[PDB]
């Protein structure tokens, strides 16, 4: 009952964000639009109940959340890594790491016992490899970005461990509200905050070889 | 009984098209070959009955059709967008839209009630965003292409609404014949018609910077 | 019992290989690391028993093995094709073929009767198209590479036909040991053997236009 309302709020908010982002930005590759549109699909699937499995302490796990993050967060990571002027091959690497983090997180959420532990460890290893080059970047853009990695991206494995995906210390519904707050921060606030600086950065890189 | 014959015809025709396209074209990236080869796989899976679900008015839905279109139609969209000399980042955007249209169409086909409606709406929104830059292109190549978008690509959501995927006004078998006709048009006739002009266009773009 | 030990050995070995490859190579796009990390995930899923189906002569089939090869072997194929200085569009083509080979091989393994035969034929056709430009390459690098294609990549369809995936002449456990030997050869020995020559090749291509 309660969790349907959370998922409905997610559908509504990301529909508004997608419509806004498409209208506000240039009518070309709009990662902000795609990230939100994909998240709409993900929230509808969770509302539908398409793959709900038993979590810890009697909660539920919605492992398609994590699988769709493999797509939307790769777009986010493209923006972040470009913003920090990583090389093209490091951008691709970081995007691969991102997909791996999300895919193994979905496995860790769904599976049990030692499989959950094993997949959570692999996800965490790839995640350390993902954020270390972001957090240690010498780019002047590192601090604008660090707050998304530290409070947003890193909030997810913390929420995961508390949630039925992990130990089940908090309920399914409270976990879902937490994931929705983190989604708004990493997928919507991120662009309101950084869209213009990222576009200006993209123009400077285009104009200046090297 | 009848629908097995339709799917068998699809297997046979796309096997011949793939063999022809591989032989006829250069032994390099051959999108025509890949589009047909992928469609072969899709028809075998539908003949096998791998994920058949109940549609409207007592028909059947073969939602893997739509999922495989996310792969083969991205290759088609690459050809179309390149043909109209869209920028590299607009090509990628249009390819993303294409995958979204097909993925949400497969969800709309499979799911029911308000979920079918919701996913059909999201698919239609992405589809309007996909074809608007194609149909309004100033490229001299726009008219050669418009007939595929207007009669072929747009025939699919019309067939979908009539089919058990949508309202079920026509039977599963009649829908499948219609989808096969649309497949031959958008995946085979398309290349017989446009292959040479697309290759010439690709050569001119390679030779002339700007 | 016995096969759990094989899968555990795979988990252990690829974890060591991934850790070694990440440490040994440059902290940038590391295909050797990703190939091994992905294979870890695949072995954990097979140990878990996530999609086990009945094979021939009373064996078992682990069709997720083949599906994950579509990802790890595309990275390998990127390295191989680059090593032979194939053009960018031929590299993409070969990578598409690779995904098709693995995807249809997973279908052939899982399905039965004429579907197994049909999908094995399609996989074999794409595989001939994949290796013919590798085996006939005029690159001086062709011979270093030919032993991986001839003994490793081609060992898989042979093992497949013997295994419960195919005729079931050998048991599930013996097939799994054979696949693990082939994995170590094509994914680990490959890099110990060829890593330096591939990096030197990549530097020469970067430095010399044409
Ligand atoms: C915009 C979001 C729209 C959300 C609408 C949610 C309506 C559902 C109401 C509901 O479930 O409230 C009760 C909830 C569950 O209580 P529990 O004891 O877990 O059962 O109790 C709660 O609401 C607790 C959940 C609130 C958690 C917010 C955490 C914020 C943490 C900030 C950290 C920095
Ligand atoms: C990390 C790497 C991940 C990257 C890519 C992952 C994205 C795909 C994840 C989707 C999983 C969906 C699984 C699913 O729908 O569960 C089975 C479902 C049961 O549904 P039932 O209870 O019958 O109602 O029945 C079904 O199978 C539903 C029918 C298929 C619905 C498919 C929806 C696909 C949407 C793709 C959108 C593309 C986004 C761009
Ligand atoms: C090349 C294609 C090979 C197809 C072989 C198909 C054999 C199956 C025969 C069959 O089902 O015919 C009867 C069919 C069903 O009749 P219904 O009342 O839906 O049951 O009735 C029909 O055949 C009707 C289906 C024909 C629909 C063709 C639509 C063309 C529309 C052009 C629009 C512009
Ligand atoms: C939009 C975004 C889509 C882009 C990418 C989508 C492509 C993947 C869609 C495939 C879905 C197949 C699902 C399926 O096979 O259904 C479950 C099936 C039940 O089969 P049963 O009735 O036992 O016989 O049992 C199975 O799971 C069958 C075993 C697996 C068969 C996998 C075939 C994969 C083929 C990939 C080819 C790559 C094309 C290039
Ligand atoms: C490093 C690998 C770690 C593997 C650990 C495996 C332990 C399992 C022990 C086991 O199953 O041995 C018995 C096995 C099955 O015998 P079968 O009659 O198939 O039942 O019998 C066998 O071991 C036979 C399997 C050995 C096959 C090796 C094939 C090498 C071929 C080289 C070709 C060139
Ligand atoms: C050729 C083209 C292939 C290219 C891409 C293919 C890669 C995806 C293949 C994964 C298939 C996994 C299917 C699976 O887990 O089977 C159903 C499983 C049943 O598990 P049960 O017995 O409940 O325990 O229940 C489940 O669905 C488990 C829950 C989902 C686990 C998803 C793991 C995804 C890992 C992606 C990692 C990305 C690698 C980089
Ligand atoms: C929705 C938007 C974003 C940026 C989501 C990010 C998610 C993560 C960083 C999740 C990480 C995980 C870790 C590191 C390990 C356990 C499994 C998780 C997938 C929750
Ligand atoms: C097989 C070849 C092609 C070009 C297929 C194209 C399919 C579509 C354009 C389908 C579109 C859909 C729409 C717009 C909305 C409902 C769901 C559909 C997937 C049928
Ligand atoms: C794990 C690493 C590698 C390089 C795996 C390669 C696998 C193949 C070349 C498999 C080929 C198949 C063929 C050609 C036809 C039957 C199905 C297979 C997938 C086994
Ligand atoms: C303009 C360039 C955007 C690049 C988008 C890359 C596509 C990411 C797909 C990841 C699939 C899991
Ligand atoms: C500049 C565009 C880079 C696109 C990066 C692609 C990442 C692909 C990851 C695929 C993993 C499934
Ligand atoms: C059922 C008792 C009412 C629950 C009130 C808590 C809901 C507020 C959640 C808001 C999260 C932003
Ligand atoms: C020669 C360039 C061809 C580009 C092919 C792009 C690959 C599309 C994959 C889409 C996956 C759903
Ligand atoms: C010039 C090659 C452009 C390739 C476009 C890639 C599209 C990736 C879409 C991935 C969505 C799942
Ligand atoms: C069962 C009665 C015969 C059905 C004849 C209609 C089949 C012709 C379909 C051709 C579609 C191109
Ligand atoms: C440095 C360039 C590496 C290119 C990696 C391509 C991504 C392959 C994804 C294939 C998905 C099945
Ligand atoms: C130089 C990087 C080339 C990357 C090749 C992408 C191959 C995409 C195959 C997608 C099939 C699902
Ligand atoms: C159960 C009888 C012992 C089986 C011994 C064979 C195991 C050796 C396999 C090693 C493969 C490299």
Residue B62 bridge partners (DSSP): B52
Can you give the resolution of this entry in Å? 2.1
Helices and strands (DSSP H and E) totals, chain B: 9, 2
Whether B37 sits inside 8 A of C119 (CB atoms) is no
Contact: A34, B111; criterion CB under 8 Å: no
Q: Say how far residue B36 (Cα) sits from the centre of its chain.
A: 11
Rounded Cα–Cα distance for residues C19 and C33 (Å): 7
Residue B108 has, within 13 A of its CA and on its CB side, a CA count of 22
Residue keyed to tokens 């950084």: A194
What subunits touch chain B, counting only 3 or more CB pairs under 8 A? Answer: A, C
Q: Is B81 on the interface with A (CB under 8 A)?
A: no
The radius of gyration of chain B from alpha carbons, rounded to an integer in Å, stands at: 17
Closest alpha carbon within chain C to B35: C96
> Rounded to the nearest 5 degrees, what angle is found at the Cα of B39, between the Cα atoms of B38 and B44?
100
C-alpha to C-alpha distances, B143 to A10, B4, B129, B136, nearest whole angstrom: 41, 36, 19, 10
What's the distance, CA A129 to chain centroid?
16
For residue C67, give Cα distances in angstroms to A108, B171, C46, C63, C109: 19, 34, 12, 7, 11
What's the gap in Å between the CA of A84 and the closest CA on chain B?
19
Q: Is C168 left (phi over 0), alpha (psi -120 to 50) or beta?
A: left
Is B44's CB within 8 Å of C126's CB?
A: no
Ligand 12 center to A16 CA (angstroms): 22
User: C51-56: long-range contacts at Cβ-Cβ below 8 A with a sequence spacing of 24 or more?
Assistant: C53/C110, C55/C109, C55/C163, C55/C164, C55/C165, C55/C168, C55/C172, C56/C164, C56/C165, C56/C166, C56/C167, C56/C168
Residue B122: both structure tokens together: 């999201």
- Strand partners of residue C62: C52
Residue numbers preceding breaks in chain A (C to N > 2.5 A):
none
Q: In chain A, what is the straight-line distance between the N-terminal and C-terminal CA atoms, in Å?
A: 55
User: Which of B26, B30, B31 for a ligand 13 pocket mutation test, highest count of atoms within 8 Å of Cβ?
Assistant: B31
- Across-strand partners of C61? C53
Three-state secondary structure call for residue B61:
strand
> Which burial class, exposed, middle or buried, applies to A10 when counting CB atoms under 10 A from its CB (0-12, 13-18, 19+)?
buried
Query: What is the whole-number distance in angstroms between the Cα of residue B102 and the centre of ligand 3?
Result: 24
HEC per residue, chain C: CHHHHHHHHHHHHHHHHHHHHHHHCCCCCCHHHHHHHHHHHHHHHHHHCCCEEECHHHCEEECHHHHHHHHHHHHHHHHHHHHCCCCHHHHHHHHHHHHHHHHHHHHHHHCCHHHHHHHHHHHHHHHHHHHHHHHCCCCCCHHHHHHHHHHHHCHHHHHHHHCCCCCCCCCHHHHHHHHHHHHHHHHHHHHHHHHHHHHHHHHHHHHCCC
CA A32–ligand 2 middle distance (angstroms): 22
Alpha carbon B189 to chain centroid distance? 13
d(CA B157, CA B163): 10
Q: Closest by alpha carbon to B72, among B128, B31, B126?
A: B31
DSSP state of B52: E
Q: Beta-carbon neighbour count of residue B43 at 10 Å? A: 25
Alpha-helical segments (H) within B84-112: 88-110
C92 CB under 6 A from ligand 17?
yes
Q: For residue B50, what are its two tokens? A: 């791998």
**Cα(A189) to centroid(ligand 13), Å:** 31
- Between CA C194 and CA C35 the distance in angstroms is 15
Using CA positions, which residue lies closest to atom 1 of ligand 9? C183
Q: Read off the tokens for C82.
A: 């680059």
Residue whose C-alpha is closest to residue B96's, from C183, A199, A35? A35
Residue B62, SS3 per DSSP: strand
Distances (CA, A) of A138 to A85, A114, A134, A151: 10, 39, 9, 20
Q: Which residues of C touch B27 (CB under 8 A)?
A: 133
Method of determination used here:
X-ray
Q: Which domains does chain A have, with CATH numbers?
A: 2-195 (1.20.1070.10)
Give dist(CA B97, CA C112) in Å, integer. Answer: 35
Alpha carbon distance B171, B36 (integer Å): 26
C142 burial via Cβ count (<10 Å: 0-12, 13-18, 19+) = middle
Picking from B17, B30, B48, B95 by the largest number of C CB atoms within 10 A of its own CB, the best residue to mutate is B48
Torsion of CA B32, B34, B37, B42, to 10 degrees: -110
Strand partners, C52: C62
Instruction: Work out the number of other CB atoms within 10 angstroms of the CB of residue C27.
Output: 12
* Chain A interface includes B122 (CB < 8 A): yes
With CA atoms as reference, report the closest residue to A149 among A89, A203, A202, A97: A97
Which residue, among A148, A160, A150, has the nearest Cα to A193 in the 3D structure? A148
* DSSP E strand boundaries for chain A: 52-54, 60-62
Count Cα atoms within 13 angstroms, Cβ side, for B107. Answer: 27
Q: How far apart are the first and last CA of chain B?
A: 55
Ligand 3 pocket: which of B177, B178, B180 to mutate (most atoms <8 Å of CB)?
A: B177
In angstroms, the CA B155 to CA B145 distance is 15
Q: What are the chain C neighbours of A118 within 8 Å (beta carbons)?
A: 44
Distance of CA C17 to the CA centre of its chain: 15
SS3 A61: strand
- Helix (H) / strand (E) element for B60: namely strand B60-62
Who lines ligand 7 at CB under 6 A?
A 66, 69, 73, 76, 101-102, 105, 108, 120, 123-124, 127, 152-153, 156-157, 160, 183, 186-187
Using DSSP bridges, classify how beta strands A60-62 and A52-54 pair: parallel, antiparallel or unpaired.
antiparallel
Listed by number, the residues of chain B in 124-143 with a beta carbon closer than 8 Å to a beta carbon of chain A are: 126, 129, 133
SS3 assignment, position B47 = helix
Which residue in C15, C34, C41 has the most chain A C-beta atoms within 10 A of its own C-beta, making it the best mutation to test that interface?
Answer: C41
Backbone φ and ψ of A52, nearest 5°: -105, 130
């Amino acid at each position: 009952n309660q969790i349907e309302i959370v998922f409905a709020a997610g559908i509504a908010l990301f529909s508004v964000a997608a419509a806004y982002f498409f209208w506000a930005y240039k009518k070309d590759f709009n990662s902000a639009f795609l990230v939100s549109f994909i998240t709409i699909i993900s929230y509808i699937l969770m509302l539908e109940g398409s793959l709900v499995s038993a979590g810890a302490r009697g909660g539920e796990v919605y492992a398609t959340r994590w699988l769709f993050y493999g797509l939307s967060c790769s777009l986010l990571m493209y923006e972040i890594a470009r913003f920090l002027r990583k090389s093209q091959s490091e951008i691709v690497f970081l995007m691969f790491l991102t997909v791996i983090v999300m895919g193994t997180g979905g496995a860790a959420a769904y599976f049990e016992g030692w499989y959950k532990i094993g997949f959570f460890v692999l996800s965490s290893v790839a995640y350390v490899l993902l954020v270390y080059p972001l957090l240690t970047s010498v780019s002047p853009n590192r601090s604008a970005v660090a707050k998304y990695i530290l409070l947003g991206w890193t909030g997810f494995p913390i929420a995961f461990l508390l949630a039925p995906d992990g130990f089940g210390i908090i309920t399914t519904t409270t976990a879902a509200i937490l994931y929705l707050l983190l989604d708004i921060f990493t997928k919507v606030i991120f662009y309101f905050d950084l869209h213009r600086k990222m576009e200006v950065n993209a123009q400077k890189v285009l104009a200046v070889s090297g």
